[PDB]
Amino acid sequence: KYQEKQRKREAEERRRFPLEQRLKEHIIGQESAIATVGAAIRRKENGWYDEEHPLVFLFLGSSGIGKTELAKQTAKYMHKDAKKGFIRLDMSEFQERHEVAKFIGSPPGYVGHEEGGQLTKKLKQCPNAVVLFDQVDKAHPDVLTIMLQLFDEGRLTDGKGKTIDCKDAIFIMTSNVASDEIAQHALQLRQEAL
Amino acid sequence: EMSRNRIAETISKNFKENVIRPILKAHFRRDEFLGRINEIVYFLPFCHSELIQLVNKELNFWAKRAKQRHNITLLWDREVADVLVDGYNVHYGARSIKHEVERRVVNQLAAAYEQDLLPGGCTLRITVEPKLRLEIIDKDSKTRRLDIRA
Numbered sequence: 001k002y003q004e005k006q007r008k009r010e011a012e013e014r015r016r017f018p019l020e021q022r023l024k025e026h027i028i029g030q031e032s033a034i035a036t037v038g039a040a041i042r043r044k045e046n047g048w049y050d051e052e053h054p055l056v057f058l059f060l061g062s063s064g065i066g067k068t069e070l071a072k073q074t075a076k077y078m079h080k081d082a083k084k085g086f087i088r089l090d091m092s093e094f095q096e097r098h099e100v101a102k103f104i105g106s107p108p109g110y111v112g113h114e115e116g117g118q119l120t121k122k123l124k125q126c127p128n129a130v131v132l133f134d135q136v137d138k139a140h141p142d143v144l145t146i147m148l149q150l151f152d153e154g155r156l157t158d159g160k161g162k163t164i165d166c167k168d169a170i171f172i173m174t175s176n177v178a179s180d181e182i183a184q185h186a187l188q189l190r191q192e193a194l
Numbered sequence: 195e196m197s198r199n200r201i202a203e204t205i206s207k208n209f210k211e212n213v214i215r216p217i218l219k220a221h222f223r224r225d226e227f228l229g230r231i232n233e234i235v236y237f238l239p240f241c242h243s244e245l246i247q248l249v250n251k252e253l254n255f256w257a258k259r260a261k262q263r264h265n266i267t268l269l270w271d272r273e274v275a276d277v278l279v280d281g282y283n284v285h286y287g288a289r290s291i292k293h294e295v296e297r298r299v300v301n302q303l304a305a306a307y308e309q310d311l312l313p314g315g316c317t318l319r320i321t322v323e324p325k326l327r328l329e330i331i332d333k334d335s336k337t338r339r340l341d342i343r344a
């Protein structure tokens with residue numbers, strides 16, 4: 001009964017000041033994006049999410065319109081100032097196929113094998129973290145192939161063989177792919193609306 | 195043109211947005227990289243007064259080296275600056291003035307120093323003959339040209 005009362009109090013707190021208003025404090029415009037991300041996180045927090053497959057976003061758009069800002073504020077909403085629950089990964093560092101060792105460590109018999117992986121360690125520290133793969137398009141696509149296991153089922157086996165469950169994580173992927181096309185189509189639609 | 199017309203009687207934002215912005219976008223291929231830059235600072239070429247100031251800076255540098263290392267008070271007229279400005283290349287910039295000073299002035303100084311035609315404390319006036327020529331001074335009416343052999 002105490003757990004149900006605490007859950008109802010948390011639900012009333014979220015209904016009083018949801019993620020949409022908390023994002024509208026920081027983010028300006030992007031009402032479609034705030035609505036999409038808020039509806040998805042509302043589906044997650046109210047228990048209406050498939051617990052097997054993690055929630056995965058791709059933020060597309062022009063430069064400096066709140067992709068990384070909305071991802072950061074989404075992480076701050078889910079975990080407050082806890083740095084464990086916001087696994088930032090600047091994917092412009094991952095421009096070559098062999099940069100997956102940062103994710104999954106190194107195999108046995110190689111340098112850096114004892115340290116293991118970086119993302120797998122950070123997700124061991126916080127399985128339900130908001131992992132921000134910032135600028136995902138700037139990485140090699142073969143490096144993004146590692147994210148298949150991590151997006152379909154939330155698993156990422158390190159160099160030492162230790163798999164980590166990451167199903168509750170909220171993966172966010174900022175990218176400027178088709179930024180010119182999205183910007184031109186939005187400007188065209190605004191001209192037609194005017 | 196406007197100055198002489200009035201006597202007879204700054205890079206603009208549009209240039210940055212219409213000319214330089216497409217060139218930067220073409221080279222760097224990413225507006226996200228350019229939008230992170232706070233100040234795209236524009237360095238313009240040198241005006242003629244700035245070329246004279248560059249020649250004076252280079253000649254003062256060699257004068258300070260001559261005074262410190264060897265105690266040779268180097269001197270020069272404004273005509274020396276006007277002569278050495280003619281070796282300025284717009285494409286190369288201030289490096290052209292440094293190379294021109296090293297060609298015309300300092301090769302002669304080095305050849306004079308190797309030949310021991312520049313004792314300590316002596317004054318030395320670079321003078322336009324236009325070929326520059328060194329002139330050692332001892333009194334208020336003695337200026338013999340240094341005969342630098344090959």
Ligand SMILES: Nc1ncnc2c1ncn2[C@@H]1O[C@H](COP(=O)(O)OP(=O)(O)OP(O)(O)=S)[C@@H](O)[C@H]1O
Pocket residue numbers: 026027028029030061062063064065066067068069070135174175176226229
């Ligand atoms: N819609 C917005 N409302 C308020 N501040 C914003 C907004 N969009 C961007 N900013 C500010 O912009 C700065 C960084 O913007 P980002 O969050 O990098 O946006 P972005 O769309 O990731 O684009 P990039 O360059 O292609 S990675 C931060 O200080 C934010 O405060």
Ligand SMILES: [Mg+2]
Pocket residue numbers: 067068134135174
């Ligand atoms: Mg960003």
